[PDB]
Amino acid sequence: QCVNLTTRTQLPPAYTNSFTRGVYYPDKVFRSSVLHSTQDLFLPFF
Amino acid sequence: SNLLLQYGSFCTQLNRALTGIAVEQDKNTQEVFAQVKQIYKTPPIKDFG
Numbered sequence A: 001q002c003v004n005l006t007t008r009t010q011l012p013p014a015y016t017n018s019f020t021r022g023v024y025y026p027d028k029v030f031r032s033s034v035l036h037s038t039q040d041l042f043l044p045f046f
Numbered sequence B: 001s002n003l004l005l006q007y008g009s010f011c012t013q014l015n016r017a018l019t020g021i022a023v024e025q026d027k028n029t030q031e032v033f034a035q036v037k038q039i040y041k042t043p044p045i046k047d048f049g
Ligand SMILES: *[C@@H]1O[C@H](CO)[C@@H](O)[C@H](O)[C@H]1NC(C)=O
Pocket: A004, A005
């Protein structure tokens, strides 16, 4: 069984800026001192 | 476009060659016409004998 919270203090959702965050390794291949271009599902900058 | 992403080197060299040609045209015009560094004005009087 669960209890539904009754006390509520709600405000509009705030928004902030993602400063070049959310980059992940696109593959499991080691790469060093190289500049690689890839298209994928990325979080756009800012 | 996603397929063409692996021919970036080919496109980069193509654009490099074309940019070189484009700069070369302006260079050619400069060498031919911009030899004189001062814009001399024709005299008001045309007493050229
Ligand atoms: C809270 O959760 C219960 C679970 O069924 C639900 O019945 C109830 O409607 C919820 N409270 C409100 C105000 O909807």
